[PDB]
Amino acid sequence: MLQPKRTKFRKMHKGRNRGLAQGTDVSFGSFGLKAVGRGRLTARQIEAARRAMTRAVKRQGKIWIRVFPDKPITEKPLAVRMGKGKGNVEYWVALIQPGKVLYEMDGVPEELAREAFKLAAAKLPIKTTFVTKTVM
Amino acid sequence: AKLHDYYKDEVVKKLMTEFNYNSVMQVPRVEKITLNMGVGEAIADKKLLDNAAADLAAISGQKPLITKARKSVAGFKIRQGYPIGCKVTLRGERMWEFFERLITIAVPRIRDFRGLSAKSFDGRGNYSMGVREQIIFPEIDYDKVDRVRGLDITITTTAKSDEEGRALLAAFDFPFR
Amino acid sequence: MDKKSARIRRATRARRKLQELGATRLVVHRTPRHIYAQVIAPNGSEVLVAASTVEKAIAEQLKYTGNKDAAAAVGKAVAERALEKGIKDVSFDRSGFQYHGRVQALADAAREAGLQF
Amino acid sequence: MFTINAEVRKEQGKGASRRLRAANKFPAIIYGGKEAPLAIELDHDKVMNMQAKAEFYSEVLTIVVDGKEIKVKAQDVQRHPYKPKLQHIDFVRA
Amino acid sequence: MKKDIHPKYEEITASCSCGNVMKIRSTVGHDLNLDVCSKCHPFFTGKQRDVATGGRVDRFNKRFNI
RNA sequence: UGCCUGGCGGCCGUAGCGCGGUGGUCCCACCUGACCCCAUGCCGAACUCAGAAGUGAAACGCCGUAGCGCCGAUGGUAGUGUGGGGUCUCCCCAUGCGAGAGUAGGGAACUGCCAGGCAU
RNA sequence: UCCUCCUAAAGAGUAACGGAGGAGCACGAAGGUUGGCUAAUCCUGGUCGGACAUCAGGAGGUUAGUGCAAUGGCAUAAGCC
RNA sequence: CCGACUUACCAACCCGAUGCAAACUGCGAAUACCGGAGAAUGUUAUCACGGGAGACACACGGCGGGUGCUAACGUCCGUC
Ligand SMILES: [K+]
Ligand SMILES: [K+]
Ligand SMILES: [K+]
Ligand SMILES: [Mg+2]
Ligand SMILES: [Mg+2]
Ligand SMILES: [Mg+2]
Ligand SMILES: [Mg+2]
Ligand SMILES: [Mg+2]
Ligand SMILES: [Mg+2]
Ligand SMILES: [Mg+2]
Ligand SMILES: [Mg+2]
Ligand SMILES: [Mg+2]
Ligand SMILES: [Mg+2]
Ligand SMILES: [Mg+2]
Ligand SMILES: [Zn+2]
């Protein structure tokens, strides 16, 4: 499951998720799944969607995961009050903005690529759309 | 110096005809000769560094510069500023005199001497060679040596490449293998 | 480094200090065959007086131009021209040479010629 | 071969350009050569269908501009981040 | 040369038993009697010692002949 | 007055790197010698001194060359001050400001004072 | 109690049992001044010598250094002799 | 001894493409702030000194944020 092998700091501010994505274009495969909504992808969600599409293509072709979950999310345990310092790190997320290409694929028919991405999108919280590599 | 005149009157002119250099200034020249003893055991007994320094003095005829550790290395238990070796750099007349002694009397005394390796060049016409034991130099009295110790010779030249550097040395009958 | 850049490194700190002080500076330049002197205005950009061994008027007096005797000549010569323009006080800029030999012979000749520095 | 109709833009900047895209237009710029850049607006749906053909980027296009015609090649395109829409196109005179 | 620090350095004659006679500078006062010099050292002739090790059939034919 | 060279500056990559060519009458560099003025944690390498037989080999100037560095529009986009609105984690409208990146293209610096050689 | 950074919204300041690290000294030289010098790392060639010691050359160009945290500085060096 | 083949694997540096950063920056706004000049408007709206205070439990709403679960009519800051 995706995590940075090491990080300079352990905990991070919440921040905000304004703006539109860089990486709007298919760059390695011929087909891809593009984010249309906005939100967080957790490492678990990314992995679940990955497993879904590879099963659909029976491991044929190649798959690129374009997003990486590098942001640590903390939570406090149950029955604890406010204060007493920042909670412990629980899981890692990637911040998604509209337009980001999440996955790419090639080496399979388009009519199979659509089916594979349909199965994967069902695992992701954000809405997504199928896109193809343009000339230029 | 004797070999210096041999350079001026023969080596330079034959090299000119060999490589077809356009200017006499283009012909390679010997710039310096440097002797190094990496004593090392000066980490134990400083008299060893002194005794090694006396040997370079006798061989070279000038007081050696003792060389300090560039940086600490735990792999050898050396701290920075510890004496590790000593060097002598020879230039001008005393360079040619040593160079003459080395060829004419010193290297003949090497055990099982078959000639020096012709490939011991750094890639830019500087030749470097080790000697295993000090006794090749008659200035060291065999009856009085404390310990075996070798040294490195390095010859620095204005040559641009090993082919030019090798030609320069061979012109002195520098005994390549 | 080449010798020229190394010398210019040595020269820089004194030159900057003199610029901040706003002094008129006497700048020597030395060469194996020749020696030069210039007096430069406080802006550093215009030459009020020059003297050099390349001038026939000076070289004609000399056995050889690359020695302390020639340097003493230009030291007298530059100081005379400077006083003829009233530039009595200057700061000596040794331009990164050692204050030795020819450069000292030039400077202390100019002092005896009445230049204040 | 592909032929396009365009109009010179009367106003430029953020607000003007968004009003175009609300009106099913989109802006474009012609530059290169010696003449100054010429700013034009294009009918979106026509050009969107044309640029679907791979020849659109390789072949020489011609744009008729208010009585002139100019021969150009598509130099760059800004696509909308996730909708199938064009934001802007650069043409270089050819 | 810093005048004080360096050892005595002196011209000495050298003589090799091959009859080569030479003059060098040295840090010693002795005349240098030599057993070998670069002139008489055998390096340019002696290599044959190893080539004699390569033969084999020119040994056995002695036994085969006898 | 033109060409070249040296010094002191303006300026601080359109000015710096790479690759190719080229210069020694002057100038500059390398260079010759070192007992001496001076110097080497050792050494005339450097610094210094006395010189002028060579060489422009190196270096340094000059010239050519876009393989790089560098510069860089127009248009669009992002962001945003003020007023208003929505489906209010984030957006939109009116008006003002408006990048960064990239693109077309530019680009192998320009210039002041003093001095010397050559030509006039 | 004191120092450095972020939070802190491009002047200053700005809270929380917010996120990260240090101090409670050292040095008559580690201060003054004059003169000089320029790093890490890596690749080649060399006695013992090894992945790593001292030596020569090259690439590189400050990625080193700063008595002790971190930030800002430093080639005219504030770094080294 | 030196060392060859092969890989069911991993693979630094360098090179080409693609992203992320409160404690990264070879870039870089709008605003805000400091200083100067000018016109109009404003019951001197400014500063100094002196007499008398009260207050030092704040609340919500917008915008920028830390904490919390981008939970709270939660909590702690900036500005209106
Ligand atoms: K250039
Ligand atoms: K701050
Ligand atoms: K009052
Ligand atoms: Mg607007
Ligand atoms: Mg501030
Ligand atoms: Mg502010
Ligand atoms: Mg100093
Ligand atoms: Mg620092
Ligand atoms: Mg109170
Ligand atoms: Mg209360
Ligand atoms: Mg209170
Ligand atoms: Mg409050
Ligand atoms: Mg409240
Ligand atoms: Mg809050
Ligand atoms: Zn002999």
PDB file of N, CA and C in Angstrom, chain C residues 21-76:
ATOM      1  N   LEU C  21      36.069  55.440   0.604  1.00  0.00           N
ATOM      2  CA  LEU C  21      36.675  56.647   1.149  1.00  0.00           C
ATOM      3  C   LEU C  21      36.649  57.808   0.169  1.00  0.00           C
ATOM      4  N   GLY C  22      36.474  57.539  -1.121  1.00  0.00           N
ATOM      5  CA  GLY C  22      36.466  58.601  -2.107  1.00  0.00           C
ATOM      6  C   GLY C  22      37.805  59.256  -2.350  1.00  0.00           C
ATOM      7  N   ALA C  23      38.901  58.558  -2.073  1.00  0.00           N
ATOM      8  CA  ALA C  23      40.232  59.099  -2.292  1.00  0.00           C
ATOM      9  C   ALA C  23      40.600  59.074  -3.770  1.00  0.00           C
ATOM     10  N   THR C  24      41.411  60.047  -4.178  1.00  0.00           N
ATOM     11  CA  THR C  24      42.179  59.921  -5.410  1.00  0.00           C
ATOM     12  C   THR C  24      43.316  58.932  -5.200  1.00  0.00           C
ATOM     13  N   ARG C  25      43.422  57.941  -6.081  1.00  0.00           N
ATOM     14  CA  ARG C  25      44.361  56.845  -5.895  1.00  0.00           C
ATOM     15  C   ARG C  25      45.396  56.803  -7.008  1.00  0.00           C
ATOM     16  N   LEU C  26      46.640  56.531  -6.618  1.00  0.00           N
ATOM     17  CA  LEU C  26      47.744  56.283  -7.540  1.00  0.00           C
ATOM     18  C   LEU C  26      47.837  54.784  -7.806  1.00  0.00           C
ATOM     19  N   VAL C  27      47.541  54.367  -9.033  1.00  0.00           N
ATOM     20  CA  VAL C  27      47.470  52.952  -9.382  1.00  0.00           C
ATOM     21  C   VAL C  27      48.722  52.563 -10.157  1.00  0.00           C
ATOM     22  N   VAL C  28      49.516  51.657  -9.588  1.00  0.00           N
ATOM     23  CA  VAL C  28      50.668  51.072 -10.264  1.00  0.00           C
ATOM     24  C   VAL C  28      50.224  49.840 -11.035  1.00  0.00           C
ATOM     25  N   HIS C  29      50.856  49.600 -12.179  1.00  0.00           N
ATOM     26  CA  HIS C  29      50.779  48.319 -12.863  1.00  0.00           C
ATOM     27  C   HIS C  29      52.180  47.902 -13.282  1.00  0.00           C
ATOM     28  N   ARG C  30      52.510  46.637 -13.057  1.00  0.00           N
ATOM     29  CA  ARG C  30      53.860  46.131 -13.230  1.00  0.00           C
ATOM     30  C   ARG C  30      53.879  44.983 -14.226  1.00  0.00           C
ATOM     31  N   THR C  31      54.981  44.882 -14.959  1.00  0.00           N
ATOM     32  CA  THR C  31      55.164  43.866 -15.980  1.00  0.00           C
ATOM     33  C   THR C  31      56.650  43.556 -16.043  1.00  0.00           C
ATOM     34  N   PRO C  32      57.036  42.349 -16.465  1.00  0.00           N
ATOM     35  CA  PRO C  32      58.472  42.042 -16.531  1.00  0.00           C
ATOM     36  C   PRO C  32      59.283  43.048 -17.327  1.00  0.00           C
ATOM     37  N   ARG C  33      58.734  43.609 -18.404  1.00  0.00           N
ATOM     38  CA  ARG C  33      59.466  44.579 -19.204  1.00  0.00           C
ATOM     39  C   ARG C  33      59.169  46.030 -18.866  1.00  0.00           C
ATOM     40  N   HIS C  34      58.063  46.333 -18.193  1.00  0.00           N
ATOM     41  CA  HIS C  34      57.644  47.720 -18.056  1.00  0.00           C
ATOM     42  C   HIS C  34      56.928  47.917 -16.732  1.00  0.00           C
ATOM     43  N   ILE C  35      56.761  49.184 -16.362  1.00  0.00           N
ATOM     44  CA  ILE C  35      55.980  49.563 -15.192  1.00  0.00           C
ATOM     45  C   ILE C  35      55.179  50.812 -15.526  1.00  0.00           C
ATOM     46  N   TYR C  36      54.009  50.938 -14.905  1.00  0.00           N
ATOM     47  CA  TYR C  36      53.043  51.971 -15.248  1.00  0.00           C
ATOM     48  C   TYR C  36      52.521  52.627 -13.981  1.00  0.00           C
ATOM     49  N   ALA C  37      52.137  53.894 -14.100  1.00  0.00           N
ATOM     50  CA  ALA C  37      51.462  54.608 -13.027  1.00  0.00           C
ATOM     51  C   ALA C  37      50.330  55.438 -13.605  1.00  0.00           C
ATOM     52  N   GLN C  38      49.186  55.420 -12.930  1.00  0.00           N
ATOM     53  CA  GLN C  38      48.058  56.280 -13.256  1.00  0.00           C
ATOM     54  C   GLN C  38      47.488  56.889 -11.988  1.00  0.00           C
ATOM     55  N   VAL C  39      47.124  58.164 -12.062  1.00  0.00           N
ATOM     56  CA  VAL C  39      46.369  58.841 -11.016  1.00  0.00           C
ATOM     57  C   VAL C  39      44.940  58.995 -11.513  1.00  0.00           C
ATOM     58  N   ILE C  40      43.984  58.453 -10.763  1.00  0.00           N
ATOM     59  CA  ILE C  40      42.602  58.327 -11.212  1.00  0.00           C
ATOM     60  C   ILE C  40      41.692  59.123 -10.289  1.00  0.00           C
ATOM     61  N   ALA C  41      40.749  59.851 -10.888  1.00  0.00           N
ATOM     62  CA  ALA C  41      39.850  60.707 -10.137  1.00  0.00           C
ATOM     63  C   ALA C  41      38.991  59.885  -9.181  1.00  0.00           C
ATOM     64  N   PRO C  42      38.363  60.539  -8.199  1.00  0.00           N
ATOM     65  CA  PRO C  42      37.547  59.796  -7.227  1.00  0.00           C
ATOM     66  C   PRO C  42      36.420  58.988  -7.841  1.00  0.00           C
ATOM     67  N   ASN C  43      35.926  59.354  -9.025  1.00  0.00           N
ATOM     68  CA  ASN C  43      34.928  58.515  -9.674  1.00  0.00           C
ATOM     69  C   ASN C  43      35.529  57.220 -10.194  1.00  0.00           C
ATOM     70  N   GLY C  44      36.853  57.141 -10.299  1.00  0.00           N
ATOM     71  CA  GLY C  44      37.512  55.967 -10.824  1.00  0.00           C
ATOM     72  C   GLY C  44      37.469  55.822 -12.326  1.00  0.00           C
ATOM     73  N   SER C  45      36.859  56.763 -13.040  1.00  0.00           N
ATOM     74  CA  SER C  45      36.554  56.585 -14.449  1.00  0.00           C
ATOM     75  C   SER C  45      37.290  57.546 -15.371  1.00  0.00           C
ATOM     76  N   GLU C  46      38.070  58.485 -14.841  1.00  0.00           N
ATOM     77  CA  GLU C  46      38.883  59.353 -15.680  1.00  0.00           C
ATOM     78  C   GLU C  46      40.273  59.499 -15.080  1.00  0.00           C
ATOM     79  N   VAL C  47      41.278  59.525 -15.950  1.00  0.00           N
ATOM     80  CA  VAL C  47      42.681  59.559 -15.558  1.00  0.00           C
ATOM     81  C   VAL C  47      43.155  61.001 -15.550  1.00  0.00           C
ATOM     82  N   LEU C  48      43.621  61.465 -14.394  1.00  0.00           N
ATOM     83  CA  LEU C  48      44.133  62.825 -14.301  1.00  0.00           C
ATOM     84  C   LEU C  48      45.578  62.913 -14.774  1.00  0.00           C
ATOM     85  N   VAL C  49      46.393  61.903 -14.468  1.00  0.00           N
ATOM     86  CA  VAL C  49      47.789  61.874 -14.885  1.00  0.00           C
ATOM     87  C   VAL C  49      48.187  60.427 -15.126  1.00  0.00           C
ATOM     88  N   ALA C  50      49.098  60.221 -16.073  1.00  0.00           N
ATOM     89  CA  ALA C  50      49.706  58.919 -16.290  1.00  0.00           C
ATOM     90  C   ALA C  50      51.199  59.080 -16.516  1.00  0.00           C
ATOM     91  N   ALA C  51      51.942  58.025 -16.196  1.00  0.00           N
ATOM     92  CA  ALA C  51      53.344  57.905 -16.563  1.00  0.00           C
ATOM     93  C   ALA C  51      53.630  56.434 -16.799  1.00  0.00           C
ATOM     94  N   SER C  52      54.451  56.140 -17.801  1.00  0.00           N
ATOM     95  CA  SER C  52      54.828  54.764 -18.075  1.00  0.00           C
ATOM     96  C   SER C  52      56.203  54.716 -18.719  1.00  0.00           C
ATOM     97  N   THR C  53      56.897  53.599 -18.505  1.00  0.00           N
ATOM     98  CA  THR C  53      58.147  53.326 -19.202  1.00  0.00           C
ATOM     99  C   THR C  53      57.976  53.126 -20.699  1.00  0.00           C
ATOM    100  N   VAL C  54      56.753  52.943 -21.200  1.00  0.00           N
ATOM    101  CA  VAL C  54      56.563  52.877 -22.643  1.00  0.00           C
ATOM    102  C   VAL C  54      56.684  54.235 -23.310  1.00  0.00           C
ATOM    103  N   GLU C  55      56.691  55.316 -22.540  1.00  0.00           N
ATOM    104  CA  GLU C  55      56.914  56.633 -23.115  1.00  0.00           C
ATOM    105  C   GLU C  55      58.376  56.788 -23.500  1.00  0.00           C
ATOM    106  N   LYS C  56      58.621  57.156 -24.758  1.00  0.00           N
ATOM    107  CA  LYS C  56      59.994  57.378 -25.198  1.00  0.00           C
ATOM    108  C   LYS C  56      60.689  58.416 -24.329  1.00  0.00           C
ATOM    109  N   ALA C  57      59.956  59.444 -23.899  1.00  0.00           N
ATOM    110  CA  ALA C  57      60.558  60.492 -23.084  1.00  0.00           C
ATOM    111  C   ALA C  57      61.207  59.937 -21.823  1.00  0.00           C
ATOM    112  N   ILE C  58      60.676  58.849 -21.275  1.00  0.00           N
ATOM    113  CA  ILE C  58      61.282  58.216 -20.105  1.00  0.00           C
ATOM    114  C   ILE C  58      62.240  57.107 -20.508  1.00  0.00           C
ATOM    115  N   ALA C  59      61.825  56.247 -21.438  1.00  0.00           N
ATOM    116  CA  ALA C  59      62.665  55.123 -21.832  1.00  0.00           C
ATOM    117  C   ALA C  59      64.013  55.588 -22.364  1.00  0.00           C
ATOM    118  N   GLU C  60      64.055  56.761 -22.994  1.00  0.00           N
ATOM    119  CA  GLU C  60      65.307  57.279 -23.529  1.00  0.00           C
ATOM    120  C   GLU C  60      66.356  57.520 -22.449  1.00  0.00           C
ATOM    121  N   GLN C  61      65.947  57.704 -21.200  1.00  0.00           N
ATOM    122  CA  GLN C  61      66.872  57.987 -20.110  1.00  0.00           C
ATOM    123  C   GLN C  61      67.475  56.740 -19.478  1.00  0.00           C
ATOM    124  N   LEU C  62      67.061  55.546 -19.886  1.00  0.00           N
ATOM    125  CA  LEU C  62      67.234  54.353 -19.072  1.00  0.00           C
ATOM    126  C   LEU C  62      68.070  53.296 -19.779  1.00  0.00           C
ATOM    127  N   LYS C  63      68.842  52.556 -18.979  1.00  0.00           N
ATOM    128  CA  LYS C  63      69.536  51.378 -19.489  1.00  0.00           C
ATOM    129  C   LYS C  63      68.552  50.268 -19.831  1.00  0.00           C
ATOM    130  N   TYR C  64      67.587  50.020 -18.951  1.00  0.00           N
ATOM    131  CA  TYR C  64      66.606  48.962 -19.132  1.00  0.00           C
ATOM    132  C   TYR C  64      65.336  49.362 -18.398  1.00  0.00           C
ATOM    133  N   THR C  65      64.196  48.924 -18.923  1.00  0.00           N
ATOM    134  CA  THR C  65      62.908  49.395 -18.432  1.00  0.00           C
ATOM    135  C   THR C  65      62.284  48.494 -17.377  1.00  0.00           C
ATOM    136  N   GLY C  66      62.818  47.301 -17.163  1.00  0.00           N
ATOM    137  CA  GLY C  66      62.187  46.342 -16.280  1.00  0.00           C
ATOM    138  C   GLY C  66      62.841  46.196 -14.924  1.00  0.00           C
ATOM    139  N   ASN C  67      63.426  47.265 -14.389  1.00  0.00           N
ATOM    140  CA  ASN C  67      64.214  47.163 -13.171  1.00  0.00           C
ATOM    141  C   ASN C  67      63.896  48.331 -12.249  1.00  0.00           C
ATOM    142  N   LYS C  68      64.443  48.260 -11.032  1.00  0.00           N
ATOM    143  CA  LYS C  68      64.138  49.256 -10.010  1.00  0.00           C
ATOM    144  C   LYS C  68      64.534  50.665 -10.425  1.00  0.00           C
ATOM    145  N   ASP C  69      65.574  50.815 -11.241  1.00  0.00           N
ATOM    146  CA  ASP C  69      65.970  52.155 -11.660  1.00  0.00           C
ATOM    147  C   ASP C  69      64.908  52.798 -12.539  1.00  0.00           C
ATOM    148  N   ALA C  70      64.328  52.031 -13.461  1.00  0.00           N
ATOM    149  CA  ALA C  70      63.240  52.556 -14.274  1.00  0.00           C
ATOM    150  C   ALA C  70      62.029  52.900 -13.421  1.00  0.00           C
ATOM    151  N   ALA C  71      61.739  52.078 -12.414  1.00  0.00           N
ATOM    152  CA  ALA C  71      60.611  52.351 -11.530  1.00  0.00           C
ATOM    153  C   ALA C  71      60.811  53.641 -10.752  1.00  0.00           C
ATOM    154  N   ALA C  72      62.028  53.888 -10.278  1.00  0.00           N
ATOM    155  CA  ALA C  72      62.307  55.154  -9.617  1.00  0.00           C
ATOM    156  C   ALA C  72      62.088  56.327 -10.559  1.00  0.00           C
ATOM    157  N   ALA C  73      62.394  56.149 -11.843  1.00  0.00           N
ATOM    158  CA  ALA C  73      62.209  57.234 -12.800  1.00  0.00           C
ATOM    159  C   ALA C  73      60.739  57.618 -12.926  1.00  0.00           C
ATOM    160  N   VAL C  74      59.864  56.638 -13.157  1.00  0.00           N
ATOM    161  CA  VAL C  74      58.444  56.953 -13.288  1.00  0.00           C
ATOM    162  C   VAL C  74      57.870  57.472 -11.977  1.00  0.00           C
ATOM    163  N   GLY C  75      58.446  57.078 -10.843  1.00  0.00           N
ATOM    164  CA  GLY C  75      57.958  57.581  -9.569  1.00  0.00           C
ATOM    165  C   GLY C  75      58.205  59.065  -9.391  1.00  0.00           C
ATOM    166  N   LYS C  76      59.402  59.527  -9.749  1.00  0.00           N
ATOM    167  CA  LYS C  76      59.646  60.960  -9.845  1.00  0.00           C
ATOM    168  C   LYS C  76      58.775  61.601 -10.917  1.00  0.00           C
TER     169      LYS C  76
END
